[PDB]
Design a protein around this ligand. Structure first.
Ligand SMILES: [Zn+2]
Lengths: 124, 404
């Protein structure tokens, strides 16, 4: 969910600011995996609302999308989601997607599953 | 700026209750999200576009949102729709009511009492109940598909398109055929236990809207002391989560029981006789009665629909009128959704949305949902709490029990 994820982001950012003894936070850059089905606008808005009434208020939030990369183990071949997209895409791939080369369905997600904060701007 | 990596742990709606050796310690729930986002984005957008955006909120009641939205818009611009198109709107709405109620009651409430899990179609039982549920679902969805097209047919000032009279006659026939099924539903839900799977019976203010012959559409609030259109208090309590609402300073409940309690005398037809027969069962002090109440509303809304259909035939040729957008219109439409009273508030300026406030019935029901967790048991308690929750018919839910 958008609001839950946004809550996680806000909590983490505020925690980092507390640890660093930050007087104020001004900018946060978050990297979202495209396998997340969340909508960037809702998440950003939610973050803005939760950011109210704290040191990290009125902060500028930037979202960077990390492409999804899959590595089939059997043939040992890597491909990207964009290659399969050309024919919602994100959720629960394991069900439908397989390697373009193998009849396998067995693969590991290397990039694009997780969400992490890549940058934080602190004012002390 | 300075790059870092801090991982966001999202192991991951639901209701959480924490219990102890000394008794229950805490109970809180975050089951729905604020519509604030929509209220924020539609500002400055065209009225049509906003009306297209609004039904995205709580998609389960897809139809209702659209209808109340356009109602609010019309009330803003000063347009008052004809009685025929209004009746048709109420018919589509009735379809949504039938679908929502039937699906909810049968697919959610019955397996709880009879203890079923997994696939809900089985030989040894439930064939007939599912036949009824599926027939009602098909009927409502078919009405929604015939008078709606999200609802593309629902437009400001009228309808996009309107079908032939033949399909309306066939609709009347199908409704009349659907009446005894709804009756069987009411009878079936009459026998099941209320206030228990530990009675949760207590004092509870119910809130509804009042319409002269029915409870579908209205322009007046329906509690013990009525108001035409007013903003009740709203409170922001966070688990750590939507905003809760308090009427007259206290939590209140909305749903079928509210319509019955407040507007009982307005009913007629078979549902009136049934209400008079089992008036004790649909009492104002219990949540589970809502389920049964919903069943009653099936029969009523079935028969009512027929009447409404006839009203549409009072004028044999029908055409969707056109309206002009006007500034300064502020329109507050308090409608009644299968979940409860749905509130839409639209202020239009220069043909664009200047103010939007939307309140979903589940927001209303959430305070009393938190209140009515006076369920004491030793785990099975999860199941009971789940039943209590499902009595309020939220969009989705799940229960988690935790010790210490
Ligand atoms: Zn392969």
């Amino acid at each position: 969910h958008e609001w839950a994820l946004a809550d996680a982001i806000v909590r983490t950012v505020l925690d980092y600011a507390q640890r660093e003894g930050a007087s104020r936070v001004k900018a946060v850059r978050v990297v979202l995996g495209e396998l997340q089905d969340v909508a960037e606008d809702i998440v950003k808005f939610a973050m803005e609302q939760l950011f109210a009434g704290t040191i990290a208020e009125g902060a500028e939030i930037e979202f960077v999308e990390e492409e999804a990369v899959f590595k089939c183990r059997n043939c040992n071949y890597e491909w990207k989601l964009k290659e399969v997209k050309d024919k919602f895409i994100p959720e629960v791939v394991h069900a439908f997607l397989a390697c373009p080369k193998c009849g396998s369905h067995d693969f590991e997600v290397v990039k694009g599953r997780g969400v992490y904060v890549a940058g934080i701007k602190i004012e002390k | 700026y300075l790059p870092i990596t801090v991982d966001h742990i999202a192991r991951v709606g639901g209701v959480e209750i924490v219990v102890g050796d000394d008794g229950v310690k805490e109970v809180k729930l975050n089951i729905i999200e604020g519509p604030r986002f929509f209220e924020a984005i539609t500002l400055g957008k065209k009225l049509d576009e906003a009306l297209a955006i609004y039904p995205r909120i709580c998609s389960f009641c897809s139809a209702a949102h659209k209808l109340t939205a356009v109602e609010a818009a019309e009330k803003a611009i000063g347009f008052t729709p004809r009685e025929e198109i209004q009746a048709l709107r109420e018919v589509l709405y009735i379809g949504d009511m039938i679908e929502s109620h039937a699906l909810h009651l049968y697919l959610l409430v019955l397996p709880d009492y009879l203890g079923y899990s997994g696939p809900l179609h089985m030989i040894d039982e439930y064939k007939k109940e599912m036949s009824i549920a599926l027939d009602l679902k098909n009927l409502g969805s078919w009405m929604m598909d015939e008078l709606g097209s999200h609802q593309e047919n629902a437009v400001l000032g009228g309808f996009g398109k309107l079908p032939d009279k033949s399909v309306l006659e066939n609709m009347k026939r199908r409704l009349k055929e659907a009446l005894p099924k709804a009756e069987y539903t009411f009878e079936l839900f009459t026998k099941l236990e209320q206030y228990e799977e530990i009675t949760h019976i207590a004092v509870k203010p119910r809130n509804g809207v009042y319409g002269i012959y029915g409870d579908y559409l209205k322009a007046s609030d329906g509690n013990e002391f009525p108001s035409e259109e007013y903003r009740e208090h709203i409170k922001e309590f966070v688990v750590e989560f939507a905003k809760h609402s308090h009427y007259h300073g206290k939590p209140f409940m909305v749903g079928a029981i509210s319509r019955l309690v407040n507007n009982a005398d307005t009913l007629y037809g078979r549902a009136k006789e049934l209400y008079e027969s089992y008036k004790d069962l649909l009492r104002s002090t219990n949540p589970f009665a809502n389920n049964l109440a919903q069943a009653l509303e099936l029969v009523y809304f079935t028969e009512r629909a027929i009447d409404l259909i006839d009203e549409a035939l009072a004028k044999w040729p029908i055409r969707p009128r056109d309206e002009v957008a006007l500034k300064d219109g502020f329109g507050v439409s308090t409608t009644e959704a299968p979940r409860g009273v749905l509130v839409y508030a639209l202020k239009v300026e220069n043909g664009r949305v200047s103010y939007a406030d939307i309140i979903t019935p589940t927001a209303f029901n959430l305070a009393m949902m938190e209140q009515h967790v006076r369920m004491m048991a030793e785990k099975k308690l999860k199941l009971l709490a789940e039943m209590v929750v499902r009595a309020y018919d939220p969009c989705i839910s799940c229960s988690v029990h935790v010790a210490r």
